[PDB]
Amino acid sequence: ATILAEQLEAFVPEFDPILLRPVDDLELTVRSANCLKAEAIHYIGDLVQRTEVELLKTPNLGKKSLTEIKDVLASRGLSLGMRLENWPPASIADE
Amino acid sequence: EFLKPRLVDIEQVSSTHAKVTLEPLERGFGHTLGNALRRILLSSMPGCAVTEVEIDGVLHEYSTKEGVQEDILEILLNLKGLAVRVQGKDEVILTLNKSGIGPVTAADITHDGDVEIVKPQHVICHLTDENASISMRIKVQRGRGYVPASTRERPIGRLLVDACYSPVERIAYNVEAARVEQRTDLDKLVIEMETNGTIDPEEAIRRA
Amino acid sequence: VTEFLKPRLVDIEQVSSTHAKVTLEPLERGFGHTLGNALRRILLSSMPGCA
Amino acid sequence: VYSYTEKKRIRKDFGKRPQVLDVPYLLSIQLDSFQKFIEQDPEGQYGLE
Amino acid sequence: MNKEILAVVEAVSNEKALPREKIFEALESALATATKKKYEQEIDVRVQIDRKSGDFDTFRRWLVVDEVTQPTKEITLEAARYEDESLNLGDYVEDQIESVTFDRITTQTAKQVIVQKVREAERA
Amino acid sequence: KPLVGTGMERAVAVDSGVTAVAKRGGVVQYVDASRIVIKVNEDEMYPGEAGIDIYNLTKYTRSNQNTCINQMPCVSLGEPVERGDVLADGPSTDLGELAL
Amino acid sequence: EIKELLKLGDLPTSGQIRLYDGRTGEQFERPVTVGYMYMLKLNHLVDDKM
Amino acid sequence: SVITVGPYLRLHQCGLPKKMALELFKPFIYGKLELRGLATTIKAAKKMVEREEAVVWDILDEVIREHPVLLNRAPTLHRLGIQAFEPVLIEGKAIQLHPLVCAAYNADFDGDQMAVHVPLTLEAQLEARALMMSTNNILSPANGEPIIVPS
Amino acid sequence: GPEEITADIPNVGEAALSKLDESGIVYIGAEVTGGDILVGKVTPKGETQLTPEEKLLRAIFGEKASDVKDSSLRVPNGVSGTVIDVQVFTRDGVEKDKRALEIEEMQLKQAKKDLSEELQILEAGLFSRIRAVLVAGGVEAEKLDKLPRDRWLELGLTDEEKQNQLEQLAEQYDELKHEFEKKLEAKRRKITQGDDLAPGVLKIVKVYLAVKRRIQPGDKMAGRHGNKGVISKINPIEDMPYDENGTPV
Ligand SMILES: [Mg+2]
């Protein structure tokens, strides 16, 4: 083994890309998606800035649709009421 | 005082296979290191093959998709033969989208920042209508040897292919007489490997 | 991926004198032959000595 | 001349005796007998007739 | 059906010398736990059994909090006050949900919880 | 395929009923794993009943011995086919031959 | 004719190639017959009889 | 099951698959599992071997040891067509049968099948080891000629 | 009484019923093991007593005593597979459950699409014939595709073989229209109707498992000359005798 081993010693802030997605990609109920669009919430980054108390003021948004939005945001590691500094980025302000 | 082997010449005669060369060697060690490194290179080398496929409108692997002239099973075999290099990950998920009449080659995969296809002319399937499109997710991971599907899927939409994590195909050594050194009764070990492009040859002989 | 079953000499049943029987385990589904063949070919000739 | 699927992969053929009668339709016993059975033909000739 | 709840409560009360109230509280907790297991999400559930009919209503409940960490069990004070202006931090908002059908699964859970309460009170 | 056959494979494959033999020759219009559409040539064609043939292949279904009697399309698109010719290989066939 | 077709390829005339061993890595004496045979799987499997 | 060769074995032992071994030795495994104390009631043991956990294979290599089995070719003509072996467990689904013993069974390997039988009681284990073991049948009873002749 | 195919069953943990839908029949595509449940059928019923808590089922659920016993027809082991095709046949009069209506809508949709594609494909061939005829004899190179395609007959062309052929193709086209109407009505009748079955059976569920058996020591291979054999050892690649090129046998 010593001979065979001696014959081998010559070898050996960046915005998270999820915030830039539309709210329709969240697989929300047709009711929840249409209620969010009526309040001009287009992106996930817009939704995440709104508080639970603000979303409950939206016309036709029920307690059930609010729970759906929380469960879906939680499945992506997001929570309601996060403050994003410099949102929306200038790349979105022109659509 | 045995003479020690040192790599001398790596003749990359084609893109797949090369001919590494060991020099010098005392008599008897030619066949010993040749058979030993052949058996290690064929046995266990780290390859980068594929594990899971999820075609979009396909429930089980025995179905047929509207607008592609091969079955889903033949698409799984053609993806099983995919020759792909990964660089800085354990596993990785590649994405494929293609629409229009003609082949779906292996260069139509949206490549990530480290995955590198080594043979982009590889056909997978043939789309055969103007609005009939496949859109699949491919899962490519590291491994060692041959890990079939029966040993190792939670939704009904995943499809498990067998996993041949093995980069080399054919390892042939040919011992021959040495004349570079004035001293006679020395040997040269010339190993022609046969890689599929996913493994550098000096890296292969170093890992072996 | 570079982690194999590192083996060891579980016993040296040296039968009588000037004769041993050394068993090694565990090896891969193919490394018993390559270590047996490597050690067999080296001991046969490479190993030096006087006579 | 060859048919177009015989220009895909034309099989090499040894063999010396030039053929004169090709292989007939191999299922002619079943089909010809049952066509003889059920076929509108009287004079007490067809199976049912 | 209805009169059968009363007959079971009376039989168990007389045989085990146990307060009917303690048996119902435990059946409510048993049914709430059986309900929680039918949902994929961790919900909070209250069950209330009517002491005369044996009928039972199942409520999903949310705890009123300032900051929601568990959207399946917690609601903001602003959202709770949209439904009832009288609610404070620490109160519960309740929605009536479909009561679990009393299959042999709930039946087995109810039996286990009854046997546990019988043992707890025999021990006392 | 058999590398060493007897040339009798095409009689056993075509003269059985596992392959999809073309009835009227012509030009293929649409190949799919489910169906195959032949456009019939004009020198083989009826005056009425305008006519382009549709072959509905038999996909994965049970045989009597619990095997898998499949049919795979073996023609390309835009390809000419002649009368009396294989379009879809069957079980244990290849290009109209017999590969057991 | 088989000999003349084995001469068209650069194969040996007698059909027999010398073959090495996989375990020992040393040559089998008296060169052996290799080729291609067309082999069939029969449906007498072993996880239907066991 | 179907037989196959396995030439590493000695004439006294034969290969026997793990799936057949866990099915034929269910009561011995139940008794062994109840002795250790891993489970309590019999049901628990039947769930354990229905699931085939990681601990029943050591139990199986405990009961197979020193317990012969009767291998039997289906047309048994003379007494050398029932011989008792010791099992060696096989990853596989085919009985590995020592080759010399094949000339006793008239068993080639062209699709042949053999039956295994388990001597349950203790006198039957001793009869399998002391009368019917394959080392004990090395001469054919019809004459004096050896039946373990190399084929 | 009759049997139940529904998944409303006690005893079975969610670990069994996760691979069934809301109506007992396994999914199409669910890769099962040896001994799971494909079709749930509460049927073997002898006798089971009711405790006060089991008697309380009468109040909320409504069932008198949940039949008499409780056990769901579960299946045995030995084979894996992937469920590729499920058939449900219903003796006429029996209530179709939700999955039998799903298969009925599915086959209605398939046969609807297939006969509509028969009409579209043969109409495409017919219009290609009209274009092939109108190459000569009053050809309109620009005026041909200004009007809708179903009126390619009243263009400028006298009484010839070509107007006769367009009249024959109009006969064929109206035949295809009324034939498509009556055949789609007959195919809806064939899908919608029940089937005559065994004496005293409600519905038959057939499930097709699709095992993929590879090769192992013990299978039988043979050439074409009588050289049989049980394959005895599946060696690694390295142990094979190779030649002086490199390829293993
Ligand atoms: Mg035999």
From Swiss-Prot, chain A:
One GO cellular-component annotation of the UniProt record comes to:
cytosolic DNA-directed RNA polymerase complex
Sites bearing ADP-ribosylarginine, chain numbering: R31
Question: Tell me, which GO biological process terms does this entry list?
Answer: bacterial-type flagellum assembly; bacterial-type flagellum-dependent cell motility; cell motility; cellular response to cell envelope stress; DNA-templated transcription initiation; intracellular iron ion homeostasis; nitrate assimilation; regulation of DNA-templated transcription elongation
Keyword vocabulary terms for this entry: Acetylation, ADP-ribosylation, DNA-directed RNA polymerase, Nucleotidyltransferase, Transcription, Transferase
Provide the function of this protein: DNA-dependent RNA polymerase (RNAP) catalyzes the transcription of DNA into RNA using the four ribonucleoside triphosphates as substrates. This subunit plays an important role in subunit assembly since its dimerization is the first step in the sequential assembly of subunits to form the holoenzyme. Part of the processive rRNA transcription and antitermination complex (rrnTAC). The complex forms an RNA-chaperone ring around the RNA exit tunnel of RNAP. It supports rapid transcription and antitermination of rRNA operons, cotranscriptional rRNA folding, and annealing of distal rRNA regions to allow correct ribosome biogenesis.
Give the family from UniProt.
Answer: Belongs to the RNA polymerase alpha chain family.
Protein name stated in the entry = DNA-directed RNA polymerase subunit alpha
Give the originating organism.
Escherichia coli (strain K12)
Q: Which gene encodes it?
A: rpoA
UniProtKB/Swiss-Prot annotation, chain C:
Instruction: Please give the record's comment on domains.
Output: The N-terminal domain is essential for RNAP assembly and basal transcription, whereas the C-terminal domain is involved in interaction with transcriptional regulators (such as CRP) and with upstream promoter elements.
Self-association and partners? Homodimer. The RNAP catalytic core consists of 2 alpha, 1 beta, 1 beta' and 1 omega subunit. When a sigma factor is associated with the core the holoenzyme is formed, which can initiate transcription. Both the N- and C-terminus interact with different regions of transcriptional regulator CRP. The rRNA transcription and antitermination complex (rrnTAC) consists of RNAP, NusA, NusB, NusE (rpsJ), NusG, SubB, ribosomal protein S4, DNA and precursor rRNA; S4 is more flexible than other subunits.
Q: Give the gene that encodes this protein.
A: rpoA
The family classification in the record reads: Belongs to the RNA polymerase alpha chain family.
What is the documented function of this protein?
DNA-dependent RNA polymerase (RNAP) catalyzes the transcription of DNA into RNA using the four ribonucleoside triphosphates as substrates. This subunit plays an important role in subunit assembly since its dimerization is the first step in the sequential assembly of subunits to form the holoenzyme.
Query: What's the protein called, per UniProt?
Result: DNA-directed RNA polymerase subunit alpha
Curated annotation (Swiss-Prot), chain H:
Q: What the entry says about post-translational processing?
A: Acetylated on several lysine residues in the presence of glucose.
Where does the source fall among the domains of life? Bacteria
The way this protein is applied in practice is: Co-administration of salinamide and rifampicin or salinamide and myxopyronin suppresses the emergence of resistance to both antibiotics.
Q: Which residues does Mg(2+) bind?
A: D108, D110, D112
Task: Give the family from UniProt.
Answer: Belongs to the RNA polymerase beta' chain family.
This molecule's function is given as: DNA-dependent RNA polymerase (RNAP) catalyzes the transcription of DNA into RNA using the four ribonucleoside triphosphates as substrates. Resistance to the antibiotics salinamide A, salinamide B, rifampicin, streptolydigin, CBR703, myxopyronin, and lipiarmycin can result from mutations in this protein.
Q: Which protein are we looking at?
A: DNA-directed RNA polymerase subunit beta'
In its UniProt entry, the species of origin is given as: Escherichia coli (strain K12)
Lineage of this protein's species? Bacteria, Pseudomonadati, Pseudomonadota, Gammaproteobacteria, Enterobacterales
Swiss-Prot record, chain I:
What is the protein's applied use?
A: Co-administration of salinamide and rifampicin or salinamide and myxopyronin suppresses the emergence of resistance to both antibiotics.
Q: How is it modified after translation?
A: Acetylated on several lysine residues in the presence of glucose.
Residues modified to N6-acetyllysine: K177
Write down the superkingdom of origin: Bacteria
Q: What does this protein do?
A: DNA-dependent RNA polymerase (RNAP) catalyzes the transcription of DNA into RNA using the four ribonucleoside triphosphates as substrates. Resistance to the antibiotics salinamide A, salinamide B, rifampicin, streptolydigin, CBR703, myxopyronin, and lipiarmycin can result from mutations in this protein.
* Subunit details: The RNAP catalytic core consists of 2 alpha, 1 beta, 1 beta' and 1 omega subunit. When a sigma factor is associated with the core the holoenzyme is formed, which can initiate transcription. The rRNA transcription and antitermination complex (rrnTAC) consists of RNAP, NusA, NusB, NusE (rpsJ), NusG, SubB, ribosomal protein S4, DNA and precursor rRNA; S4 is more flexible than other subunits. In pull-down experiments interacts with CedA.
Tell me which family the UniProt entry assigns to this protein.
Belongs to the RNA polymerase beta chain family.
How is this protein named in the record? DNA-directed RNA polymerase subunit beta
The organism's lineage is: Bacteria, Pseudomonadati, Pseudomonadota, Gammaproteobacteria, Enterobacterales
